[PDB]
mmCIF file of C-alpha atoms in Angstrom:
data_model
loop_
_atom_site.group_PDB
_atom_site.id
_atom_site.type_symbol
_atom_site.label_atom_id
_atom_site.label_comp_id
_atom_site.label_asym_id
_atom_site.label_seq_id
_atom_site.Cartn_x
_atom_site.Cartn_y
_atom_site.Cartn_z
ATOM 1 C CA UNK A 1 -11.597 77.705 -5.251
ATOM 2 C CA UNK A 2 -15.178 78.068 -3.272
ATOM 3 C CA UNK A 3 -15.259 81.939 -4.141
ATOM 4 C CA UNK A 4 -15.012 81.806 -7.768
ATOM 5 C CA UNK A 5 -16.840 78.177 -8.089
ATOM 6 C CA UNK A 6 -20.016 78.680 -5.793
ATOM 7 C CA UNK A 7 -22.493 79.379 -8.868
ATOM 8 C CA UNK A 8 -21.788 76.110 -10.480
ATOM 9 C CA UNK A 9 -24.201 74.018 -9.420
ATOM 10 C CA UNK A 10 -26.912 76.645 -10.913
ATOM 11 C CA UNK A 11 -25.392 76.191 -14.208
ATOM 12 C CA UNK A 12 -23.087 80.162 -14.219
ATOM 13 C CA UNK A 13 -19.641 81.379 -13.900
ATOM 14 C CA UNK A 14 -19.055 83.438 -10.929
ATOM 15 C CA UNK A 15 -17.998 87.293 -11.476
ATOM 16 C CA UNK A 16 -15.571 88.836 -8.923
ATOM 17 C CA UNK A 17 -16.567 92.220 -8.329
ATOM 18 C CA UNK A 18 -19.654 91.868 -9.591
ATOM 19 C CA UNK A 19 -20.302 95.817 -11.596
ATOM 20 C CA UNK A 20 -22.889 96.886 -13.894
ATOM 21 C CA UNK A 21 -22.691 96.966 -17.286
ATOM 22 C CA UNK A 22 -21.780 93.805 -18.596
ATOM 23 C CA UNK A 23 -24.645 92.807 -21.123
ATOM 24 C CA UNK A 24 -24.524 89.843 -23.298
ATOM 25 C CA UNK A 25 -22.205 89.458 -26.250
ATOM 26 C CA UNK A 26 -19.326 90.241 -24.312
ATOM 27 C CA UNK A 27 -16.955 88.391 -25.802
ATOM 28 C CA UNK A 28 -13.930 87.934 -23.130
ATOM 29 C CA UNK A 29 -10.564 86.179 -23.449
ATOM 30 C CA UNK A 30 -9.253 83.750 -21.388
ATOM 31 C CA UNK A 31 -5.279 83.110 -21.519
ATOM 32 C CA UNK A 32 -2.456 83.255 -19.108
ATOM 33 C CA UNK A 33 -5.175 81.983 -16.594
ATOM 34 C CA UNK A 34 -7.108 84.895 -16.029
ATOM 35 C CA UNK A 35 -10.099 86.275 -17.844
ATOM 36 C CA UNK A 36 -10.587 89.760 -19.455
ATOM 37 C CA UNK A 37 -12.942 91.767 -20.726
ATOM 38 C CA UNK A 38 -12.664 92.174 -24.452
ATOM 39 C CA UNK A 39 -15.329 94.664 -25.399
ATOM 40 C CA UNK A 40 -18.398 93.735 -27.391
ATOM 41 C CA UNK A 41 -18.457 90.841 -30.365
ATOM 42 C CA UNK A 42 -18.852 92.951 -32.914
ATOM 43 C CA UNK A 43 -15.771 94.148 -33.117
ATOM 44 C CA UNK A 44 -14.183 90.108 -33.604
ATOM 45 C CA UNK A 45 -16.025 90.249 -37.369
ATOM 46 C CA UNK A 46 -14.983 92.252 -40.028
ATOM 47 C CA UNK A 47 -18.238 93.370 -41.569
ATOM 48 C CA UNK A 48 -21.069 93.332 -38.862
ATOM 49 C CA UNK A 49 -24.018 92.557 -40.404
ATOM 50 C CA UNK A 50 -27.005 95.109 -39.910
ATOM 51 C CA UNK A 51 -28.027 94.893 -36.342
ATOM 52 C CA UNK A 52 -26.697 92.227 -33.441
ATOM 53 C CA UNK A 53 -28.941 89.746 -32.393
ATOM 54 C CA UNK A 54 -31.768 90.924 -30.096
ATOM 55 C CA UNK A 55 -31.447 90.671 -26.011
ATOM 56 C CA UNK A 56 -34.353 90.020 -23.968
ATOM 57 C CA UNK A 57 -34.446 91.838 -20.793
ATOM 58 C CA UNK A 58 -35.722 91.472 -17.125
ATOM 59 C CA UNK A 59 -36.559 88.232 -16.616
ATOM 60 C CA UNK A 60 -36.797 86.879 -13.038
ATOM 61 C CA UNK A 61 -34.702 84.145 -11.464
ATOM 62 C CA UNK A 62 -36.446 84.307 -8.159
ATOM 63 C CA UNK A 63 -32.796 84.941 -5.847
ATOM 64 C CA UNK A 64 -29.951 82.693 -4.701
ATOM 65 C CA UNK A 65 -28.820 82.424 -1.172
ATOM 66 C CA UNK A 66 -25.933 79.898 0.087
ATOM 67 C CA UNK A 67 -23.034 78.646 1.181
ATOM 68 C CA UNK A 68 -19.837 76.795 0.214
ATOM 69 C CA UNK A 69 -17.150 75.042 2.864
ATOM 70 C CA UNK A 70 -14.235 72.782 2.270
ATOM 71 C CA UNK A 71 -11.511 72.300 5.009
ATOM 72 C CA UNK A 72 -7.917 70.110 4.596
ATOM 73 C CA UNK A 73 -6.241 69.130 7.320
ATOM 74 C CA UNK A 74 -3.098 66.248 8.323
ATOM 75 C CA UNK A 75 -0.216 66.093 10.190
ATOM 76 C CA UNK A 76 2.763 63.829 9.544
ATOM 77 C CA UNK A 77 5.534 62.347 11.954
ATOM 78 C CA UNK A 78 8.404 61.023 11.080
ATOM 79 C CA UNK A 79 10.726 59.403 13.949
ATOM 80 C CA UNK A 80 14.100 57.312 13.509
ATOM 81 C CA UNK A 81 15.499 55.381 16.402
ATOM 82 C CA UNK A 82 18.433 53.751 14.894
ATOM 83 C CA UNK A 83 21.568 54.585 13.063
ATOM 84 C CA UNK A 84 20.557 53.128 9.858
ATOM 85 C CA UNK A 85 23.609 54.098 7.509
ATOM 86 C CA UNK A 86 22.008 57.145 7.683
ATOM 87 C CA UNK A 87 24.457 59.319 9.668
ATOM 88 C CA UNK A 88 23.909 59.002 13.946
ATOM 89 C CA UNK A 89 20.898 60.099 15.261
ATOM 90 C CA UNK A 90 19.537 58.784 18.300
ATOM 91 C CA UNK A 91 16.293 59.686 17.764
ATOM 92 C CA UNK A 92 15.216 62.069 14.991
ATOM 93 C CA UNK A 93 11.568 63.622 15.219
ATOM 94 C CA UNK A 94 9.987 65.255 12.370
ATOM 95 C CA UNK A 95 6.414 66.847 12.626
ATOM 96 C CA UNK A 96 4.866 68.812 9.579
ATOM 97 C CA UNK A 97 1.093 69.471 10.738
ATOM 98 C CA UNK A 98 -1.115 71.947 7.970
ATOM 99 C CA UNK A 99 -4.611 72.704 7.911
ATOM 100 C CA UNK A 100 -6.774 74.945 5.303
ATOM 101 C CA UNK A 101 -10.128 76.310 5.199
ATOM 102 C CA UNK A 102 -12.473 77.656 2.650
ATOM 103 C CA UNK A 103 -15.755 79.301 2.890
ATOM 104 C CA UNK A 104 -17.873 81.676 1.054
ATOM 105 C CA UNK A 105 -21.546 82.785 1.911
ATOM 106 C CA UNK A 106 -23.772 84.753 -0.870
ATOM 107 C CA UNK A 107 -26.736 86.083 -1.306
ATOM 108 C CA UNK A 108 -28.521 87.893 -3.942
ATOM 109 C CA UNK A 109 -32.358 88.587 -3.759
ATOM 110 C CA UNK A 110 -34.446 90.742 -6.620
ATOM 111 C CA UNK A 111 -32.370 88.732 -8.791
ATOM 112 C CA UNK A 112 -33.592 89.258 -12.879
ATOM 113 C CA UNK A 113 -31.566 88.174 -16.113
ATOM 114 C CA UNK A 114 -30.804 89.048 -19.556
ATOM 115 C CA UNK A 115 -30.017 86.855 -22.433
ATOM 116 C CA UNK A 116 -29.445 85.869 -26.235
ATOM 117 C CA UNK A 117 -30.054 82.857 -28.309
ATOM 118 C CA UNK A 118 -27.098 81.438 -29.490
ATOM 119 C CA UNK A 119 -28.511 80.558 -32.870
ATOM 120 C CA UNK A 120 -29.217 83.925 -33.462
ATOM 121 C CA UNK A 121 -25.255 84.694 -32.371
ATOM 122 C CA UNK A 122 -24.357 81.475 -35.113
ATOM 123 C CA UNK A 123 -26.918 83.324 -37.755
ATOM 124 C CA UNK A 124 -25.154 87.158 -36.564
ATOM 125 C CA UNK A 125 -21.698 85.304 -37.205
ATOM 126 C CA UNK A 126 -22.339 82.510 -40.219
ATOM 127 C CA UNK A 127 -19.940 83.037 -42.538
ATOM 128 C CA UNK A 128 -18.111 86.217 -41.679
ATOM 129 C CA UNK A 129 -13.803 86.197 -41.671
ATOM 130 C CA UNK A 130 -12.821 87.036 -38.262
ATOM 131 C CA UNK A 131 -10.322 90.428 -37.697
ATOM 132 C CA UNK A 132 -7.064 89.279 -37.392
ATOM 133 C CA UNK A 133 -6.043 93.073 -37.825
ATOM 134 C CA UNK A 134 -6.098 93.893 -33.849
ATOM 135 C CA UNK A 135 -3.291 92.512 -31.952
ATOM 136 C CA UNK A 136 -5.802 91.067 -29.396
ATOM 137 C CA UNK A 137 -7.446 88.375 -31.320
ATOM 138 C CA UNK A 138 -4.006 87.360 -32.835
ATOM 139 C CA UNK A 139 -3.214 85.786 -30.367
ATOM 140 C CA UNK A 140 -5.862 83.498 -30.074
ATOM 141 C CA UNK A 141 -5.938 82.943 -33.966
ATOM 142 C CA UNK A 142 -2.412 81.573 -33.019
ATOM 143 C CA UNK A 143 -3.955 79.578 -30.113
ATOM 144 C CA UNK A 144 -2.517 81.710 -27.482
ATOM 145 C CA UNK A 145 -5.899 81.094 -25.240
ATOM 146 C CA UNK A 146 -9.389 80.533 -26.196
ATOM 147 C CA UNK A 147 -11.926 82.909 -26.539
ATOM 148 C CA UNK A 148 -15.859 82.902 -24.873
ATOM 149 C CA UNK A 149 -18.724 85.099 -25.941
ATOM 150 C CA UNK A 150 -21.345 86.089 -22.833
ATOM 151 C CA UNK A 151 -24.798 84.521 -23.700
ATOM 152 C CA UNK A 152 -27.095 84.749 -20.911
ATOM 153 C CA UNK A 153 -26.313 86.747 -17.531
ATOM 154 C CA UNK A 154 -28.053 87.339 -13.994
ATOM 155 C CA UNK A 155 -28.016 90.982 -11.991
ATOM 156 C CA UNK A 156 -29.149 92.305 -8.615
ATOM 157 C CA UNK A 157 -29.612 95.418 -6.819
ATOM 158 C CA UNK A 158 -29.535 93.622 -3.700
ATOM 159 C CA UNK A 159 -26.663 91.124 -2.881
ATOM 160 C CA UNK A 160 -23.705 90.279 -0.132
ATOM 161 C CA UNK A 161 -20.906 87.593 -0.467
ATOM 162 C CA UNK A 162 -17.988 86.801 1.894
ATOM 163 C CA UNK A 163 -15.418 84.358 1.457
ATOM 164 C CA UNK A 164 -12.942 83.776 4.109
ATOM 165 C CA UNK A 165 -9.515 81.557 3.172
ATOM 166 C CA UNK A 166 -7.393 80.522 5.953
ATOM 167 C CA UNK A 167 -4.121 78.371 5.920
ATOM 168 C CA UNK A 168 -1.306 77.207 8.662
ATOM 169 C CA UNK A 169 1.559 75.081 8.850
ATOM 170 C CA UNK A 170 3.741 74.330 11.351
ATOM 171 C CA UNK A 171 7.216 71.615 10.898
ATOM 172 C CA UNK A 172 9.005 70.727 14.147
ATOM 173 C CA UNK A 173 12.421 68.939 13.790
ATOM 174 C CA UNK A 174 15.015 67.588 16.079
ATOM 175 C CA UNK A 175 18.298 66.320 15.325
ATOM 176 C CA UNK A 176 20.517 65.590 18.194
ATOM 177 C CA UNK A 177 23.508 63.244 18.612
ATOM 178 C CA UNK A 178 24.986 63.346 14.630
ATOM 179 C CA UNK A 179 29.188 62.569 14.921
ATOM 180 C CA UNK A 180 29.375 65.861 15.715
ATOM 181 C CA UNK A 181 28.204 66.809 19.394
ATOM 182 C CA UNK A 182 25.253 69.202 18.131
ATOM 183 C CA UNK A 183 21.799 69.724 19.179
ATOM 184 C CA UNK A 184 19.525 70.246 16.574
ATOM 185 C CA UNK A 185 15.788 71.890 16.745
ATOM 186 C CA UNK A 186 13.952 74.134 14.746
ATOM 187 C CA UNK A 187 10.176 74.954 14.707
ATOM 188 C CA UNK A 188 8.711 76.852 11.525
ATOM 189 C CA UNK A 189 5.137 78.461 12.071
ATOM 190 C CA UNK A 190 3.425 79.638 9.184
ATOM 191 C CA UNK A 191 -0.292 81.457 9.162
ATOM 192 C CA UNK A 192 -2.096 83.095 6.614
ATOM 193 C CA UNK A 193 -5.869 84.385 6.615
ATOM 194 C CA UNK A 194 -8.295 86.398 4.541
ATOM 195 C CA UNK A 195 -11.717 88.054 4.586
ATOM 196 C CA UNK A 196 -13.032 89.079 1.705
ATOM 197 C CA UNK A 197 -17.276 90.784 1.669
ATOM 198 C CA UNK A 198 -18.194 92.443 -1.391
ATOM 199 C CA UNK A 199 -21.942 93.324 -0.811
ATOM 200 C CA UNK A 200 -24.736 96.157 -2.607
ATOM 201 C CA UNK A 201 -28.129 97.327 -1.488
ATOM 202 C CA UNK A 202 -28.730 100.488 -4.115
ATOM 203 C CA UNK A 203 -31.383 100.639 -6.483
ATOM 204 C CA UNK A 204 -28.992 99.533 -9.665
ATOM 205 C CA UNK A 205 -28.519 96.304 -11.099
ATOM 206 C CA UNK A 206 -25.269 94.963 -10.757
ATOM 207 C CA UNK A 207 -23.987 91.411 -12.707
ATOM 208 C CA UNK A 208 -22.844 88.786 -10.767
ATOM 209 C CA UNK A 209 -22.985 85.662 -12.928
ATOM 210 C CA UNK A 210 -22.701 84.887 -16.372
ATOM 211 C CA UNK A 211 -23.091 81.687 -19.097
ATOM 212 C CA UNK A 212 -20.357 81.348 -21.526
ATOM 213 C CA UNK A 213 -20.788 79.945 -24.817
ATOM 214 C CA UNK A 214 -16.749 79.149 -26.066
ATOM 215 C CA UNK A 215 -16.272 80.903 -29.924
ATOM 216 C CA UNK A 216 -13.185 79.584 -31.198
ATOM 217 C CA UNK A 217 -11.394 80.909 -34.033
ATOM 218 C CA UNK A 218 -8.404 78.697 -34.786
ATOM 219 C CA UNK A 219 -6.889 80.284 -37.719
ATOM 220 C CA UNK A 220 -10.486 81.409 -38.816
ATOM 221 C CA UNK A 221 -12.312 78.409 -38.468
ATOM 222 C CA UNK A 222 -14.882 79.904 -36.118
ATOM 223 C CA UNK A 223 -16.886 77.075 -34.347
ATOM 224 C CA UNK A 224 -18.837 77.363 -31.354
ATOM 225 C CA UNK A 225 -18.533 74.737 -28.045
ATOM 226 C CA UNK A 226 -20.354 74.840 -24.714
ATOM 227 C CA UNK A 227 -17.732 75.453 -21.827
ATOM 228 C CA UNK A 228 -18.129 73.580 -18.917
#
């Protein structure tokens, strides 16, 4: 959650594997959960008209450094002393104990961005039937997922970020006594961790965050929403 959320508070959607070469008007899809690339907006209309709208470049942003934590953690016990119409135990202990942790640190410095005016996108677009042709966008004129067009996005040559994820569990239960003259015990240990540092120090500029204005097509009533 932390390492695909921790540019929210700056008002941005967080790119994993942040690359180069992801300018505005990048209209991407988002169904089935995950988001994909879907080339550039031009190709949604059927008759592009003239040129796209203009893209200022190179504008600073003055860096970004920070961090993000979040930890869950409780343990349960369960005991029964008594018969209860429940079978025969004598006692019965139950003890399910799981802890997480989340963190993710990043840092980009010589940060500059690149953007587009969403009027001019609305005055690009204006009345223009949308290509149901391609496979792709049928789909979404069906309402299979919704669609979101790249406005404004941030780059860096020089940038680090690390997330680490870490979750265990652990459930202890004993049964003795039961009508039957059995022992029961079993302990169940569970541990799972993850470090993840995706970092760049060349001379390129590399994305790493983008705004996403939401185009939605609907059948071909294209309308335009701000995603939150």
């Amino acid at each position: 959650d932390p390492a695909i959320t921790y540019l929210k508070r700056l008002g941005y959607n967080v790119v994993r594997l942040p690359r180069e070469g992801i300018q505005p008007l990048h209209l991407l899809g988002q169904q089935r959960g995950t988001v994909e690339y879907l080339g550039s907006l031009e190709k949604l209309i059927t008759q592009p008209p003239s040129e796209p709208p203009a893209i200022t470049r190179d504008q600073a942003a003055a860096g970004i450094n920070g961090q993000k934590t979040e930890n869950l953690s409780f343990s349960i016990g369960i005991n029964i002393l008594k018969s209860v119409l429940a079978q025969f135990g004598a006692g019965a202990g139950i003890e399910a104990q799981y802890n997480q942790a989340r963190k993710v640190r990043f840092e980009f410095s010589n940060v500059l961005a690149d953007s587009v005016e969403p009027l001019a996108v609305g005055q690009f677009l204006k009345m223009a039937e949308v290509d149901a042709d391609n496979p792709v966008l049928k789909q979404y004129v069906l309402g299979n997922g919704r669609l979101y067009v790249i406005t404004q996005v941030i780059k860096s040559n020089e940038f680090t970020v690390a997330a680490e994820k870490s979750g265990g569990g652990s459930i202890q239960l004993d049964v003795p006594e039961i009508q039957k003259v059995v022992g029961g015990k079993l302990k169940v240990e569970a541990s799972v961790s993850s470090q993840s540092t995706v970092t760049y120090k060349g001379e390129k500029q590399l994305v790493f965050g983008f705004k996403c204005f939401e185009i939605g097509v609907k059948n071909g009533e294209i309308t335009l929403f701000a995603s939150q």
